[PDB]
From a paper:
If the HK incorporates a REC domain (REC-1) is denoted as hybrid histidine kinase (hHK), and the first His-Asp phosphotransfer event occurs in the same polypeptide chain. Then, HPt protein containing a phosphorylatable His shuffles the phosphoryl group from the phosphorylatable Asp in the REC-1 domain to the phosphorylatable Asp in the REC domain of an RR (REC-2) in two more phosphotransfer steps.
Motivated by our findings and to analyze the Leu-Thr switch in another fungus, we set up crystallization trials with the REC-1 domain of [name] (RECCal_[name]) in the presence of phosphomimetic, either isolated or together with Cal_Ypd1. We obtained crystals for RECCal_[name] isolated which contained four molecules in the AU. Again, the molecules did not contain phosphomimetic in the active center, but contained a Mg2+ ion bound stabilized by interactions with the phosphorylatable D1300, residue D1251 in loop β1–α1, main chain carbonyl oxygen of Q1302 in loop β3–α3 and three water molecules. Also, the overall structure was similar to REChHK6 (rmsd of 0.7 Å in 115 residues), but, the loop β4–α4 was ordered and well defined although its conformation slightly differed from REChHK6, as well as the position of α4. The structure of RECCal_[name] also provided two interesting features. On one side, the N-terminal H1243 in one molecule was located at a close distance (<6–8 Å) of the phosphorylatable D1300 in another neighbor molecule, however, the distance was not close enough to stabilize the phosphomimetic as it does a catalytic His. In this way, all four molecules of RECCal_[name] lack the Leu-Thr switch so Thr in β4 (T1329) and Phe in β5 (F1348) were oriented away from the active center.
Residue numbers in the entry: 1240 to 1367
Amino acid sequence: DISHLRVLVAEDNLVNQEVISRMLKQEGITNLTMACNGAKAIDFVKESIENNENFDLIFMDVQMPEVDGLKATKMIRKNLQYNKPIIALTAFADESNVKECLNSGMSGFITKPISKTNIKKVLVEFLS
Ligand SMILES: [Mg+2]
């Protein structure tokens, strides 16, 4: 009952992209877009708003080259006016970097490595 969702995953680690994609597919997601950095992420969101192929949810790796997840999240929130959930993927969450994430406009976070339970929880909490 979740094949209606369209999900964007921004992750600069290709092994990680495959892992999260497989998890999302196992949960029933069929509409998935991968972004290798924050610049690609911004580009994909802009298109989705224009074309009514809107993303229901974004998973945003915090640390990526060229444009990181924090900069991408700020652009997506404030420039593109995207107001749906953005979930940070973080290798390390401490007081300083969490405040930075929240200030960027993140809706929540998962510490890497992610588990299927984390995906299920995000879906029920944000997209029920
Ligand atoms: Mg990364």
